[PDB]
Protein backbone atom coordinates (compact mmCIF):
# COMPACT_ATOMS: atom_id res chain seq x y z
CA UNK A 481 0.00 0.00 0.00
CA UNK A 482 1.11 3.63 -0.43
CA UNK A 483 0.69 4.30 3.33
CA UNK A 484 -0.98 2.80 6.39
CA UNK A 485 -4.06 4.89 5.61
CA UNK A 486 -4.19 3.35 2.14
CA UNK A 487 -3.75 -0.05 3.77
CA UNK A 488 -6.69 0.61 6.11
CA UNK A 489 -9.10 1.47 3.34
CA UNK A 490 -7.82 -1.32 1.12
CA UNK A 491 -8.33 -3.90 3.88
CA UNK A 492 -11.79 -2.52 4.60
CA UNK A 493 -12.74 -2.65 0.93
CA UNK A 494 -11.63 -6.29 1.01
CA UNK A 495 -13.64 -7.22 4.10
CA UNK A 496 -10.39 -7.95 5.98
CA UNK A 497 -11.46 -6.72 9.40
CA UNK A 498 -8.31 -8.14 10.98
CA UNK A 499 -6.06 -6.44 8.43
CA UNK A 500 -7.78 -3.10 8.98
CA UNK A 501 -7.69 -3.45 12.77
CA UNK A 502 -3.95 -4.08 12.67
CA UNK A 503 -3.40 -0.65 11.08
CA UNK A 504 -4.07 0.90 14.52
CA UNK A 505 -1.46 1.36 17.25
CA UNK A 506 -2.35 -0.28 20.54
CA UNK A 507 -2.92 3.18 22.09
CA UNK A 508 -4.97 4.41 19.08
CA UNK A 509 -8.40 6.03 19.33
CA UNK A 510 -11.22 6.27 16.84
CA UNK A 511 -13.18 9.44 17.54
CA UNK A 512 -16.60 8.71 16.11
CA UNK A 513 -18.67 11.42 14.44
CA UNK A 514 -21.64 11.14 16.85
CA UNK A 515 -21.90 10.70 20.59
CA UNK A 516 -22.02 12.55 23.89
CA UNK A 517 -18.42 13.78 24.10
CA UNK A 518 -19.45 15.18 21.49
CA UNK A 519 -18.62 12.21 19.34
CA UNK A 520 -17.48 8.99 20.94
CA UNK A 521 -14.03 7.68 21.84
CA UNK A 522 -13.33 4.07 20.86
CA UNK A 523 -10.11 2.43 22.00
CA UNK A 524 -8.38 -0.22 19.95
CA UNK A 525 -10.16 -3.07 21.72
CA UNK A 526 -13.46 -1.42 20.81
CA UNK A 527 -12.51 -0.65 17.20
CA UNK A 528 -12.71 -4.20 15.85
CA UNK A 529 -16.46 -4.38 16.50
CA UNK A 530 -16.93 -1.04 14.71
CA UNK A 531 -15.17 -2.53 11.69
CA UNK A 532 -17.47 -5.57 11.75
CA UNK A 533 -20.48 -3.25 11.84
CA UNK A 534 -19.12 -1.16 8.98
CA UNK A 535 -18.43 -4.22 6.83
CA UNK A 536 -22.02 -5.36 7.15
CA UNK A 537 -23.39 -1.85 6.49
CA UNK A 538 -21.17 -1.63 3.42
CA UNK A 539 -22.68 -4.84 2.03
CA UNK A 540 -26.21 -3.67 2.85
CA UNK A 541 -25.91 -0.30 1.08
CA UNK A 542 -24.32 -2.04 -1.92
CA UNK A 543 -27.35 -4.33 -2.16
CA UNK A 544 -29.53 -1.20 -2.31
CA UNK A 545 -27.54 0.23 -5.21
CA UNK A 546 -25.65 2.75 -3.10
CA UNK A 547 -22.01 3.61 -3.80
CA UNK A 548 -19.54 4.41 -1.01
CA UNK A 549 -16.72 6.62 -2.31
CA UNK A 550 -13.49 7.28 -0.38
CA UNK A 551 -11.23 9.89 -1.95
CA UNK A 552 -7.50 9.38 -2.13
CA UNK A 553 -5.85 10.44 1.16
CA UNK A 554 -4.23 13.88 1.06
CA UNK A 555 -1.40 14.40 3.50
CA UNK A 556 -0.86 17.67 5.35
CA UNK A 557 2.37 19.68 5.55
CA UNK A 558 2.72 17.64 8.74
CA UNK A 559 3.31 14.27 7.02
CA UNK A 560 1.90 12.35 10.01
CA UNK A 561 -1.57 13.87 9.37
CA UNK A 562 -3.87 13.38 6.43
CA UNK A 563 -7.50 13.83 5.42
CA UNK A 564 -9.74 11.38 3.63
CA UNK A 565 -12.95 12.82 2.16
CA UNK A 566 -15.80 10.35 1.66
CA UNK A 567 -19.44 10.13 0.58
CA UNK A 568 -22.35 7.76 0.11
CA UNK A 569 -24.27 8.14 -3.14
CA UNK A 570 -27.51 6.71 -4.43
CA UNK A 571 -27.07 4.79 -7.67
CA UNK A 572 -27.87 7.85 -9.82
CA UNK A 573 -25.23 9.92 -7.95
CA UNK A 574 -27.26 11.76 -5.30
CA UNK A 575 -25.33 12.22 -2.04
CA UNK A 576 -27.01 11.03 1.15
CA UNK A 577 -23.94 11.01 3.43
CA UNK A 578 -20.75 13.03 3.31
CA UNK A 579 -17.86 13.40 5.69
CA UNK A 580 -14.13 13.65 6.26
CA UNK A 581 -11.63 11.74 8.42
CA UNK A 582 -8.59 13.43 9.94
CA UNK A 583 -5.81 10.86 10.55
CA UNK A 584 -2.87 11.16 12.91
CA UNK A 585 -0.08 8.64 12.36
CA UNK A 586 2.86 7.51 14.44
CA UNK A 587 5.64 5.17 13.29
CA UNK A 588 3.57 3.75 10.43
CA UNK A 589 0.47 3.11 12.50
CA UNK A 590 -2.79 5.00 12.87
CA UNK A 591 -2.85 6.82 16.20
CA UNK A 592 -6.05 8.86 15.75
CA UNK A 593 -8.92 8.52 13.32
CA UNK A 594 -11.10 11.60 13.89
CA UNK A 595 -14.37 11.22 11.96
CA UNK A 596 -16.75 14.04 10.98
CA UNK A 597 -19.92 13.94 8.88
CA UNK A 598 -22.53 16.36 7.63
CA UNK A 599 -25.76 16.26 9.62
CA UNK A 600 -28.54 15.78 7.08
CA UNK A 601 -30.93 17.19 9.66
CA UNK B 602 -2.49 38.29 8.16
CA UNK B 603 -0.36 35.25 7.31
CA UNK B 604 -3.16 34.06 4.96
CA UNK B 605 -6.74 34.93 4.04
CA UNK B 606 -7.78 32.22 6.52
CA UNK B 607 -5.91 34.04 9.29
CA UNK B 608 -7.60 37.27 8.17
CA UNK B 609 -11.05 35.67 8.25
CA UNK B 610 -10.79 34.46 11.85
CA UNK B 611 -9.16 37.72 13.00
CA UNK B 612 -12.07 39.73 11.57
CA UNK B 613 -14.79 37.36 12.75
CA UNK B 614 -13.54 37.42 16.33
CA UNK B 615 -13.71 41.23 16.26
CA UNK B 616 -17.33 41.19 15.08
CA UNK B 617 -16.18 42.78 11.80
CA UNK B 618 -18.78 41.10 9.60
CA UNK B 619 -17.82 43.24 6.60
CA UNK B 620 -14.14 42.32 6.85
CA UNK B 621 -14.84 38.62 7.28
CA UNK B 622 -17.24 38.74 4.34
CA UNK B 623 -14.64 40.34 2.08
CA UNK B 624 -12.44 37.23 2.51
CA UNK B 625 -14.79 35.27 0.24
CA UNK B 626 -14.57 35.13 -3.53
CA UNK B 627 -17.72 36.30 -5.28
CA UNK B 628 -18.28 32.70 -6.41
CA UNK B 629 -17.49 31.27 -2.97
CA UNK B 630 -19.71 28.77 -1.12
CA UNK B 631 -19.98 28.13 2.61
CA UNK B 632 -21.04 24.49 3.03
CA UNK B 633 -22.71 24.43 6.45
CA UNK B 634 -22.51 21.41 8.74
CA UNK B 635 -26.27 20.71 8.73
CA UNK B 636 -28.97 20.63 6.08
CA UNK B 637 -30.63 18.49 3.41
CA UNK B 638 -27.78 18.35 0.90
CA UNK B 639 -26.48 16.93 3.36
CA UNK B 640 -25.29 20.22 4.79
CA UNK B 641 -26.51 23.57 3.50
CA UNK B 642 -24.99 25.67 0.74
CA UNK B 643 -24.60 29.43 1.29
CA UNK B 644 -23.47 31.57 -1.63
CA UNK B 645 -21.55 34.78 -1.02
CA UNK B 646 -24.74 36.88 -0.92
CA UNK B 647 -26.14 34.54 1.76
CA UNK B 648 -22.91 34.37 3.79
CA UNK B 649 -23.19 37.86 5.24
CA UNK B 650 -26.40 37.02 7.12
CA UNK B 651 -24.82 33.80 8.33
CA UNK B 652 -21.90 35.86 9.62
CA UNK B 653 -24.32 38.20 11.42
CA UNK B 654 -26.24 35.26 12.93
CA UNK B 655 -22.94 33.71 14.01
CA UNK B 656 -21.84 37.07 15.42
CA UNK B 657 -24.80 37.22 17.82
CA UNK B 658 -24.26 33.52 18.51
CA UNK B 659 -20.75 34.38 19.67
CA UNK B 660 -22.00 37.12 22.00
CA UNK B 661 -24.39 34.68 23.67
CA UNK B 662 -21.68 32.09 24.27
CA UNK B 663 -19.26 34.86 25.25
CA UNK B 664 -21.88 36.12 27.72
CA UNK B 665 -21.77 32.72 29.44
CA UNK B 666 -18.06 32.00 30.01
CA UNK B 667 -17.81 29.85 26.87
CA UNK B 668 -14.70 30.22 24.72
CA UNK B 669 -14.22 29.20 21.10
CA UNK B 670 -10.79 28.03 19.92
CA UNK B 671 -9.78 28.04 16.24
CA UNK B 672 -6.50 26.31 15.47
CA UNK B 673 -3.94 27.58 13.02
CA UNK B 674 -4.72 26.29 9.50
CA UNK B 675 -2.65 23.30 8.41
CA UNK B 676 -2.34 23.15 4.64
CA UNK B 677 -2.67 20.06 2.48
CA UNK B 678 -0.13 18.98 -0.11
CA UNK B 679 -2.40 21.02 -2.41
CA UNK B 680 -1.32 24.41 -1.04
CA UNK B 681 -4.70 25.97 -1.88
CA UNK B 682 -6.44 23.77 0.72
CA UNK B 683 -6.19 23.75 4.52
CA UNK B 684 -7.93 22.33 7.59
CA UNK B 685 -8.86 24.39 10.65
CA UNK B 686 -9.77 22.39 13.76
CA UNK B 687 -12.02 24.20 16.22
CA UNK B 688 -13.82 23.72 19.53
CA UNK B 689 -16.25 25.54 21.82
CA UNK B 690 -15.69 24.92 25.50
CA UNK B 691 -17.15 25.89 28.84
CA UNK B 692 -15.16 27.89 31.38
CA UNK B 693 -14.20 24.68 33.20
CA UNK B 694 -12.94 23.18 29.91
CA UNK B 695 -15.85 20.90 29.02
CA UNK B 696 -16.22 20.59 25.25
CA UNK B 697 -19.63 21.75 24.03
CA UNK B 698 -18.96 21.60 20.29
CA UNK B 699 -16.07 20.50 18.10
CA UNK B 700 -15.51 20.45 14.37
CA UNK B 701 -13.23 20.98 11.41
CA UNK B 702 -13.29 23.31 8.43
CA UNK B 703 -11.81 22.35 5.08
CA UNK B 704 -10.89 25.53 3.20
CA UNK B 705 -10.34 25.81 -0.52
CA UNK B 706 -8.57 29.02 -1.51
CA UNK B 707 -8.15 30.64 -4.90
CA UNK B 708 -6.34 33.85 -5.85
CA UNK B 709 -6.01 34.87 -2.21
CA UNK B 710 -9.73 34.54 -1.42
CA UNK B 711 -11.81 31.80 0.18
CA UNK B 712 -13.55 29.77 -2.52
CA UNK B 713 -15.00 27.02 -0.30
CA UNK B 714 -15.47 26.73 3.46
CA UNK B 715 -16.61 23.13 4.08
CA UNK B 716 -17.77 22.83 7.70
CA UNK B 717 -18.11 19.61 9.71
CA UNK B 718 -19.11 19.23 13.37
CA UNK B 719 -19.42 16.33 15.75
CA UNK B 720 -23.04 15.45 16.43
CA UNK B 721 -23.89 15.61 20.14
CA UNK B 722 -26.09 12.56 20.77
CA UNK B 723 -26.74 9.88 23.33
CA UNK B 724 -26.44 7.39 20.45
CA UNK B 725 -27.03 6.89 16.72
CA UNK B 726 -28.68 3.73 15.38
Ligand SMILES: CCC[C@H]1C(=O)CC(=O)O[C@@H]1CC(=O)/C(C)=C/C[C@@H]1O[C@](C)(CCO)C[C@@H]1C
Nearest residue numbers: 511512513514533534535537538548567568595
Ligand atom coordinates in the same frame (compact mmCIF):
# COMPACT_ATOMS: atom_id res chain seq x y z
C1 LIG C 1 -21.22 1.53 13.07
C2 LIG C 1 -21.23 3.05 13.36
C3 LIG C 1 -19.85 3.65 13.14
C4 LIG C 1 -19.90 4.88 12.17
C5 LIG C 1 -20.48 6.10 12.94
O1 LIG C 1 -21.66 6.10 13.27
C6 LIG C 1 -19.47 7.26 13.23
C7 LIG C 1 -18.01 6.90 13.03
O2 LIG C 1 -17.08 7.61 13.36
O3 LIG C 1 -17.68 5.66 12.49
C8 LIG C 1 -18.54 5.16 11.61
C9 LIG C 1 -18.77 6.05 10.35
C10 LIG C 1 -17.64 5.86 9.40
O4 LIG C 1 -16.49 5.54 9.71
C11 LIG C 1 -17.97 5.96 7.95
C12 LIG C 1 -16.82 6.19 7.14
C13 LIG C 1 -19.24 5.80 7.56
C14 LIG C 1 -19.43 5.88 6.10
C15 LIG C 1 -20.23 4.77 5.38
O5 LIG C 1 -19.41 3.55 5.47
C16 LIG C 1 -19.77 2.63 4.49
C17 LIG C 1 -20.80 1.78 5.20
C18 LIG C 1 -18.55 1.81 4.03
C19 LIG C 1 -17.59 1.16 5.12
O6 LIG C 1 -17.28 -0.12 4.90
C20 LIG C 1 -20.34 3.55 3.31
C21 LIG C 1 -20.54 4.98 3.90
C22 LIG C 1 -19.69 6.00 3.18
Ligand SMILES: CCC[C@H]1C(=O)CC(=O)O[C@@H]1CC(=O)/C(C)=C/C[C@@H]1O[C@](C)(CCO)C[C@@H]1C
Nearest residue numbers: 613614632633634635655658659669689716718
Ligand atom coordinates in the same frame (compact mmCIF):
# COMPACT_ATOMS: atom_id res chain seq x y z
C1 LIG D 1 -17.84 28.05 12.40
C2 LIG D 1 -19.34 28.12 12.00
C3 LIG D 1 -19.68 27.04 10.96
C4 LIG D 1 -21.04 26.59 11.22
C5 LIG D 1 -21.86 26.29 9.93
O1 LIG D 1 -21.26 26.01 8.91
C6 LIG D 1 -23.36 26.17 10.12
C7 LIG D 1 -23.60 25.03 11.10
O2 LIG D 1 -24.68 24.39 11.18
O3 LIG D 1 -22.49 24.61 11.99
C8 LIG D 1 -21.17 25.20 11.98
C9 LIG D 1 -20.54 25.30 13.38
C10 LIG D 1 -21.28 26.28 14.20
O4 LIG D 1 -22.43 26.62 13.95
C11 LIG D 1 -20.61 26.92 15.37
C12 LIG D 1 -21.60 27.41 16.23
C13 LIG D 1 -19.29 26.99 15.45
C14 LIG D 1 -18.72 27.68 16.63
C15 LIG D 1 -19.16 29.10 17.06
O5 LIG D 1 -18.59 30.11 16.20
C16 LIG D 1 -18.47 31.36 16.86
C17 LIG D 1 -19.77 32.10 16.56
C18 LIG D 1 -17.22 32.11 16.34
C19 LIG D 1 -16.97 32.31 14.76
O6 LIG D 1 -16.85 33.58 14.37
C20 LIG D 1 -18.36 30.99 18.40
C21 LIG D 1 -18.77 29.51 18.51
C22 LIG D 1 -17.60 28.72 19.15
